[PDB]
Design an enzyme around this catalytic site. Structure first.
Site, mmCIF file in Angstrom:
data_model
loop_
_atom_site.group_PDB
_atom_site.id
_atom_site.type_symbol
_atom_site.label_atom_id
_atom_site.label_comp_id
_atom_site.label_asym_id
_atom_site.label_seq_id
_atom_site.Cartn_x
_atom_site.Cartn_y
_atom_site.Cartn_z
ATOM 1 N N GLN A 2 -9.891 20.664 17.115
ATOM 2 C CA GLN A 2 -11.023 21.467 17.555
ATOM 3 C C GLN A 2 -12.295 20.634 17.557
ATOM 4 O OE1 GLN A 2 -10.845 26.001 16.356
ATOM 5 N NE2 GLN A 2 -9.734 24.830 14.795
ATOM 6 N N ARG A 15 -5.635 18.372 6.556
ATOM 7 C CA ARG A 15 -6.798 18.812 7.310
ATOM 8 C C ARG A 15 -7.982 17.934 6.958
ATOM 9 N NH1 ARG A 15 -7.557 24.502 7.451
ATOM 10 N NH2 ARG A 15 -9.800 24.018 7.571
HETATM 11 C C1 LIG Z 1 -15.052 22.450 -2.507
HETATM 12 C C2 LIG Z 1 -14.414 23.437 -1.566
HETATM 13 C C3 LIG Z 1 -14.152 23.066 -0.246
HETATM 14 C C4 LIG Z 1 -13.554 23.956 0.645
HETATM 15 N N1 LIG Z 1 -13.307 23.547 1.950
HETATM 16 C C5 LIG Z 1 -12.756 24.426 2.776
HETATM 17 C C6 LIG Z 1 -12.501 24.021 4.150
HETATM 18 O O1 LIG Z 1 -12.749 22.921 4.642
HETATM 19 N N2 LIG Z 1 -11.918 25.011 4.926
HETATM 20 C C7 LIG Z 1 -11.564 26.286 4.505
HETATM 21 O O2 LIG Z 1 -11.048 27.068 5.315
HETATM 22 N N3 LIG Z 1 -11.809 26.653 3.216
HETATM 23 C C8 LIG Z 1 -12.387 25.767 2.407
HETATM 24 N N4 LIG Z 1 -12.629 26.140 1.114
HETATM 25 C C9 LIG Z 1 -12.264 27.502 0.704
HETATM 26 C C10 LIG Z 1 -13.234 28.558 1.220
HETATM 27 O O3 LIG Z 1 -14.544 28.301 0.710
HETATM 28 C C11 LIG Z 1 -12.750 29.942 0.779
HETATM 29 O O4 LIG Z 1 -11.378 30.063 1.144
HETATM 30 C C12 LIG Z 1 -13.516 31.121 1.385
HETATM 31 O O5 LIG Z 1 -13.954 30.825 2.715
HETATM 32 C C13 LIG Z 1 -14.664 31.563 0.507
HETATM 33 O O6 LIG Z 1 -14.149 31.844 -0.810
HETATM 34 P P1 LIG Z 1 -15.105 32.148 -2.029
HETATM 35 O O7 LIG Z 1 -16.571 32.036 -1.710
HETATM 36 O O8 LIG Z 1 -14.588 33.477 -2.585
HETATM 37 O O9 LIG Z 1 -14.700 31.014 -3.060
HETATM 38 P P2 LIG Z 1 -14.996 29.453 -3.131
HETATM 39 O O10 LIG Z 1 -15.466 29.006 -1.790
HETATM 40 O O11 LIG Z 1 -13.838 28.769 -3.749
HETATM 41 O O12 LIG Z 1 -16.244 29.330 -4.067
HETATM 42 C C14 LIG Z 1 -16.152 29.594 -5.484
HETATM 43 C C15 LIG Z 1 -17.365 28.978 -6.145
HETATM 44 O O13 LIG Z 1 -17.466 29.452 -7.514
HETATM 45 C C16 LIG Z 1 -17.822 28.373 -8.343
HETATM 46 N N5 LIG Z 1 -17.387 28.697 -9.697
HETATM 47 C C17 LIG Z 1 -16.097 28.819 -10.144
HETATM 48 N N6 LIG Z 1 -16.000 29.157 -11.408
HETATM 49 C C18 LIG Z 1 -17.321 29.268 -11.818
HETATM 50 C C19 LIG Z 1 -17.903 29.613 -13.050
HETATM 51 N N7 LIG Z 1 -17.193 29.915 -14.140
HETATM 52 N N8 LIG Z 1 -19.256 29.657 -13.119
HETATM 53 C C20 LIG Z 1 -19.966 29.328 -12.036
HETATM 54 N N9 LIG Z 1 -19.524 29.011 -10.816
HETATM 55 C C21 LIG Z 1 -18.185 28.986 -10.776
HETATM 56 C C22 LIG Z 1 -17.165 27.154 -7.709
HETATM 57 O O14 LIG Z 1 -17.827 25.970 -8.141
HETATM 58 C C23 LIG Z 1 -17.377 27.446 -6.214
HETATM 59 O O15 LIG Z 1 -18.614 26.937 -5.710
HETATM 60 C C24 LIG Z 1 -13.231 25.250 0.200
HETATM 61 C C25 LIG Z 1 -13.504 25.627 -1.111
HETATM 62 C C26 LIG Z 1 -14.086 24.732 -2.001
HETATM 63 C C27 LIG Z 1 -14.351 25.160 -3.422
HETATM 64 C C1 LIG Z 2 -6.664 28.113 13.538
HETATM 65 C C2 LIG Z 2 -6.383 29.623 13.462
HETATM 66 C C3 LIG Z 2 -6.938 30.134 12.125
HETATM 67 C C4 LIG Z 2 -7.203 30.267 14.552
HETATM 68 N N1 LIG Z 2 -8.579 30.185 14.621
HETATM 69 C C5 LIG Z 2 -9.005 30.909 15.720
HETATM 70 C C6 LIG Z 2 -10.286 31.144 16.201
HETATM 71 C C7 LIG Z 2 -10.420 31.935 17.322
HETATM 72 CL CL1 LIG Z 2 -12.021 32.294 17.911
HETATM 73 C C8 LIG Z 2 -9.324 32.478 17.974
HETATM 74 C C9 LIG Z 2 -8.049 32.235 17.483
HETATM 75 C C10 LIG Z 2 -7.869 31.450 16.353
HETATM 76 C C11 LIG Z 2 -6.731 31.020 15.587
HETATM 77 C C12 LIG Z 2 -5.275 31.296 15.815
HETATM 78 C C13 LIG Z 2 -4.407 30.222 15.138
HETATM 79 C C14 LIG Z 2 -4.325 28.862 15.846
HETATM 80 N N2 LIG Z 2 -3.524 27.955 15.020
HETATM 81 C C15 LIG Z 2 -2.440 27.259 15.728
HETATM 82 C C16 LIG Z 2 -1.517 26.730 14.632
HETATM 83 C C17 LIG Z 2 -1.848 27.550 13.384
HETATM 84 C C18 LIG Z 2 -2.827 28.614 13.893
HETATM 85 C C19 LIG Z 2 -3.905 29.093 12.900
HETATM 86 C C20 LIG Z 2 -4.881 30.021 13.648
HETATM 87 C C21 LIG Z 2 -2.152 29.872 14.449
HETATM 88 O O1 LIG Z 2 -0.951 30.099 14.384
HETATM 89 N N3 LIG Z 2 -3.015 30.686 15.067
#
Ligand SMILES: Cc1cc2nc3c(=O)[nH]c(=O)nc-3n(C[C@H](O)[C@H](O)[C@H](O)COP(=O)(O)OP(=O)(O)OC[C@H]3O[C@@H](n4cnc5c(N)ncnc54)[C@H](O)[C@@H]3O)c2cc1C
Ligand SMILES: CC1(C)c2[nH]c3cc(Cl)ccc3c2C[C@@]23CN4CCC[C@]4(C[C@@H]12)C(=O)N3
Length: 444
Positions: free
Chosen positions: A228, A188
């Site tokens: 997208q 990705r």
């Molecule tokens: C660098 C990065 C890039 C990402 N990119 C994507 C993406 O492109 N698409 C996607 O779908 N998801 C992405 N994710 C994941 C996404 O942010 C999560 O899946 C979700 O949307 C939000 O999870 P969260 O806020 O619980 O945790 P996270 O987003 O993982 O954030 C956790 C935060 O806690 C901080 N942290 C950890 N341990 C400590 C500590 N001991 N003390 C202080 N701070 C700490 C980390 O530095 C981080 O900023 C990414 C996550 C990270 C960390």
């Molecule tokens: C990208 C995802 C998170 C998505 N994001 C959306 C946003 C809106 Cl607003 C509506 C629908 C979706 C969906 C359905 C999707 C489309 N993708 C096709 C291959 C894998 C995946 C992941 C999943 C799938 O199977 N279903």
């Protein structure tokens, strides 16, 4: 006449949402984060209507207005086979009745960060939080700065929003269960818009994107690919779910080989056209992220009720399903609402009520997302054409995206309090009843 003092560990999307929710509801917030969270890293985050409903309240609409350029304008998902033939147009009219966002994670962080600062959240970057403790009166953590200095920070409770590799988690669940690999991973990235413009062979991808965001899906043997756009073609992003048995680490920073993606798609008729766009990903921005299946934790709240896990620290979901960030935002809203209804003299009650409201719903989303990771939707594409049967329907479920977590919490608060104080199981109705027992979810 003193405010509740909230401590927040980690400022990813969920920690920032928790800080905003808590501060806008009249509580003091001191949030800690180890990294420069403004750096450009990762690709795009999707937020569905259950999250935008919450975000719309922040600053009397200020954050929604900042996010308006990122409102999803796709009316349909265009589902294609390995020839690029359009098989099915899946209608999104119900899903998009209310706003959804799609935007680079770094831009969502920036917008939320600026609002948090504006409303008076105290933010300390460059701090690794360690060693939480609690008793019946309060909680504390150690703030470790990069010079090695240690500062004790005290509060009424600790919000542990420190992500999938949460070290706070062992203060609740000291024996950690291991996620199991699904056998799949996701390539990705964002596309470099500048070089994408000026490639005449990629010009097709701009068609109509100023009126309707691109949302193309392609099914090839061994690949589920989505392309997208968002914000009137200013940003293009893509992902490709594929088979991968390698011992990959679930982080967003590791080098990945762009030629692996080219090899996967170039052997099918549509591959060259897809690569005309995907080739404009910067080389060090290719991510190959493993899709690991995490089991629900036994619970989220500590023994004295002054630490709670939320977000990916509580219920990591793969990026392949589309509810990871949105469920974490629901955590933040329900927790802040519960704290506001319980008051400062009932903090443990507030955290235990939020856990009871959130647990089964979050766990159902988690367990269903395991099927997307293990490719249950896939079929033999030599025999079948892809259609709605093959699209993971989690983002299409009204019971998820139509839900109003704040209204639910306000209406149910006293019933949950009674269940907590009488030691009765609380049976939440923010998920379908058949689902909880079908998935083997055990109430906390
Ligand atoms: C660098 C990065 C890039 C990402 N990119 C994507 C993406 O492109 N698409 C996607 O779908 N998801 C992405 N994710 C994941 C996404 O942010 C999560 O899946 C979700 O949307 C939000 O999870 P969260 O806020 O619980 O945790 P996270 O987003 O993982 O954030 C956790 C935060 O806690 C901080 N942290 C950890 N341990 C400590 C500590 N001991 N003390 C202080 N701070 C700490 C980390 O530095 C981080 O900023 C990414 C996550 C990270 C960390
Ligand atoms: C990208 C995802 C998170 C998505 N994001 C959306 C946003 C809106 Cl607003 C509506 C629908 C979706 C969906 C359905 C999707 C489309 N993708 C096709 C291959 C894998 C995946 C992941 C999943 C799938 O199977 N279903």
């Amino acid at each position: 006449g003193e405010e509740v003092q909230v401590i927040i560990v980690g400022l990813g999307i969920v920690g920032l949402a928790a800080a905003i929710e808590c501060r806008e509801k009249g509580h003091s917030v001191h949030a800690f984060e180890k990294s420069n969270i403004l750096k450009s890293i990762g690709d795009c985050i999707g937020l569905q209507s259950n999250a935008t409903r919450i975000i719309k309240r922040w600053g009397d609409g200020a954050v929604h207005e900042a996010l308006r350029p990122w409102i999803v304008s796709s009316k349909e998902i265009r589902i294609h086979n390995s020839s690029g033939r359009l098989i099915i147009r899946q209608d999104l009219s119900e899903v998009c009745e209310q706003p959804n966002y799609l935007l680079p994670r770094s831009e969502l962080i920036r917008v939320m960060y600026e609002h948090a600062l504006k409303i008076g959240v105290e933010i300390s970057l460059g701090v690794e939080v360690c060693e939480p403790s609690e008793d019946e009166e309060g909680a504390s953590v150690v703030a470790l700065t990069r010079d090695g200095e240690r500062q004790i920070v005290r509060g009424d409770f600790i919000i542990c929003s420190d992500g999938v590799h949460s070290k706070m988690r062992k203060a609740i669940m000291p024996q950690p269960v291991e996620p199991r690999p699904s056998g799949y991973a996701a390539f990705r990235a964002l596309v470099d818009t500048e070089t994408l413009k000026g490639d005449p062979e990629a010009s097709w991808v701009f068609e109509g994107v100023e009126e309707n965001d691109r949302f193309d899906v392609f099914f090839l043997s061994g690949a589920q690919i989505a392309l997208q756009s968002c914000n009137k073609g200013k940003v293009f992003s893509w992902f490709c779910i594929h088979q991968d048995t390698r011992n990959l680490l679930d982080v967003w920073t590791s080098p990945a080989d762009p030629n692996e993606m080219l090899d996967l798609i170039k052997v099918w008729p549509i591959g060259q056209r897809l690569w005309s766009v995907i080739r404009h990903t910067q080389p060090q921005k290719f991510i190959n992220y493993p899709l690991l299946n995490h089991k629900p934790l036994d619970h989220w709240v500590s023994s004295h009720g002054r630490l709670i896990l939320i977000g990916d620290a509580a219920h990591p979901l793969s990026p392949a399903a589309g509810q990871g960030a949105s469920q974490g935002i629901e955590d933040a809203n329900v927790l802040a609402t519960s704290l506001s209804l319980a008051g400062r003299q009932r903090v443990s009650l507030a955290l235990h009520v939020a856990e009871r409201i959130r647990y089964a719903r979050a766990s159902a989303v988690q367990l269903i997302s395991h099927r997307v990771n293990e490719g249950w939707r896939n079929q033999d594409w030599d025999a079948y054409e892809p259609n709605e049967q093959n699209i993971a329907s989690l983002p299409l479920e009204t019971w998820i995206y139509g839900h109003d977590s704040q209204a639910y919490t306000e209406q149910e608060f006293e019933m949950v309090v009674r269940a907590v104080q009488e030691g009765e199981e609380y049976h939440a109705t923010n998920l379908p009843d058949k689902l909880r027992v079908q998935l083997g979810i055990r109430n906390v």
